[PDB]
Design a protein around this ligand. Structure first.
Ligand code: HEM
Ligand code: HEM
Ligand code: HEM
Ligand code: HEM
Lengths: 146, 141, 141, 146
């Protein structure tokens, strides 16, 4: 993605303050709650019948940590999102059959999780930069679909 | 929201499909899978090759449902309730997909009904497919 | 469709906004212009600079339309019909942009109501803004 | 845009049988008729109150041929639609204030006009290559927006 250096500096600065374990569990859980159809991939996760069943579910929480852990590493490679996510792009396509649109949904839920968390600190310009980031990841993850 | 002209226009176009709905439905699915490969994430269990029987068969299913839609243009919600339930609670196809298929069906129709696929008929079917799509995703959340 | 809890959730979250509606509306706007630059194409006659009072003036309007829809949660189509007419026939804003602003509004709210912006509330607000957008684009064709 | 040579070979070959005049006239007319809000940019074209008012309006038409004419040329730059449309990008953004989404809408109406006109000949595969084309154009035209 083409980020300003004050943009990439902005992304990176804030990201340094996020707790990936709990932000991952929070963004994944919120995705399942707000876009319930996304639950289609998680029947083996158990009870997702309520916002608390979802949010406090240890599998949901543990999966969020992995997605975000993964997201966090693409962050070190803003200049090569595609190669970064190439094998994960194939895994999601070829093996999990995840509609890439799910990637965009999560990006947005992520953006709202950040706001919620950083408050005033997630400024108009900070958001605009993250919007760029989440869009690049969604596209990088969708790259190898065929 | 379908106007009397829109409905009249969909019955016309659709009536001329007649016997080929099945054929057109499967072609629409085939164009979609090729034009929008991400749509394939929903039929991992179908053989998606050209002239596949699953596709062929599914094409008819969709076709037929469209026909029932046209027949109950004024009570789609009720005519399509079971299908909405199905898509919203079991299938859970991402709403953005309804648009790709609708488009595919428009192309399919254009390509088979030259004379009847008028700017006005085009506008109408578009609105039609849009409302069918809305009805199918109305119970998602 | 908004369930009793959706409504309760939007009456509560919006209740907290209370006073900052206009202020929040303006921020939502600024968030949209910056993140989704394509949105600027509708406001060529505006000053889009940080703190422009054109933006402040417009944010307030938006926020009051929202406040009004909330107050008429049970009759949103009628409450906002004038606004639908307007967007449908004069502004003619591509429907896609409603989704972008709605997102910016959710961001804005999340940013100001850390305590009330719960998964449940987030969910209800999202459906709420979607029905508002739906109402507003219902007369486009 | 990533086109196969069989993809490009097929694009090229049908494009060769296009009467840009009437196909551009038809495409833009349908746009105005199917997605009536796109008319907001053409009040000066006159009467657009009916599909015939629209279809038969000489401005629509000439504007259609003009648009389709520029489409034609990018075809000569399938490898650089980006730089091919840079100026038109700035113009549509900077001057005409055209929401780039309209470009997507047009591409889809186009695809529909081609089908209509080529019937049987505009095959699932020919459509698929074209879909790649009009999406690349929309993106190239949307390129310089800021
Ligand atoms: C947005 C960026 C995303 C990233 C970086 C990401 C990352 C990952 C990773 C690292 C894995 C584990 C790979 C493995 O087991 O080999 C995984 C698995 C998975 N992902 Fe993604 N993911 C993303 C988005 C999504 C979304 C949006 C969904 C659907 C709503 C999703 C659905 C899945 C599923 C169902 C699994 C398998 C879990 C299991 O073992 O049952 N992912 N993802
Ligand atoms: C015009 C919009 C649509 C209509 C009228 C429609 C209609 C139908 C019908 C009639 C069925 C069969 C249920 C039965 O077995 O009785 C079905 C199932 C299904 N639809 Fe939809 N559908 C539409 C859109 C979509 C879209 C856009 C997708 C995803 C790309 C989709 C994916 C599926 C799948 C995966 C199944 C089940 C397939 C199987 O198990 O054979 N549908 N649909
Ligand atoms: C839920 C979302 C929205 C609400 C509640 C809303 C509400 C309003 C209201 C109350 C007005 C002013 C009417 C008056 O002057 O009485 C307005 C005007 C306007 N809106 Fe919307 N709107 C929404 C979405 C959008 C979007 C997404 C755009 C474009 C991206 C947009 C573009 C405009 C424009 C260009 C005007 C004219 C304003 C001026 O010149 O001051 N609106 N809207
Ligand atoms: C999709 C690809 C498109 C291409 C390649 C394209 C190309 C062009 C070109 C080459 C011009 C001539 C400008 C000049 O030098 O004076 C033009 C003008 C214009 N186009 Fe675009 N166009 C496209 C789509 C659209 C769409 C979808 C809209 C709006 C619905 C639009 C609205 C306009 C307007 C308003 C003008 C100015 C008309 C005038 O000179 O009076 N264009 N376009």
């Amino acid at each position: 993605v083409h980020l300003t250096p004050e943009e990439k500096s902005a992304v990176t600065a804030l990201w340094g303050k996020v707790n990936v374990d709990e932000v991952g569990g929070e963004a994944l859980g919120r995705l399942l709650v707000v876009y319930p159809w996304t639950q289609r991939f998680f029947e083996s996760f158990g009870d997702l019948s309520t916002p608390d069943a979802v949010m406090g579910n240890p599998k949901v929480k543990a999966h969020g940590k992995k997605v975000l852990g993964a997201f966090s590493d693409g962050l070190a490679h803003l200049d090569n999102l595609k190669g970064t996510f190439a094998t994960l792009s194939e895994l999601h396509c070829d093996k999990l059959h995840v509609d890439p649109e799910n990637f965009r949904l999560l990006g947005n839920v992520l953006v709202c999780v950040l706001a919620h968390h950083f408050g005033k600190e997630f400024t108009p310009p900070v958001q605009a930069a993250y919007q760029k980031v989440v869009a690049g990841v969604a596209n990088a993850l969708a790259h190898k679909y065929h | 929201v379908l106007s009397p002209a829109d409905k009249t226009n969909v019955k016309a176009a659709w009536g001329k499909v007649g016997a080929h709905a099945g054929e057109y439905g499967a072609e629409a699915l085939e164009r979609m899978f090729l034009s929008f490969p991400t749509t394939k994430t929903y039929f991992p269990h179908f053989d998606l090759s050209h002239g596949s029987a699953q596709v062929k068969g599914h094409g008819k299913k969709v076709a037929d449902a469209l026909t029932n839609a046209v027949a109950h243009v004024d009570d789609m919600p009720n005519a399509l309730s079971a299908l909405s339930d199905l898509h919203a609670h079991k299938l859970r196809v991402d709403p953005v997909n309804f648009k790709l298929l609708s488009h595919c069906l428009l192309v399919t129709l254009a390509a088979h009904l030259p004379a009847e696929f008028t700017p006005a008929v085009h506008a109408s079917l578009d609105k039609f497919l849009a409302s069918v799509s809305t009805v199918l995703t109305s119970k998602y959340r």
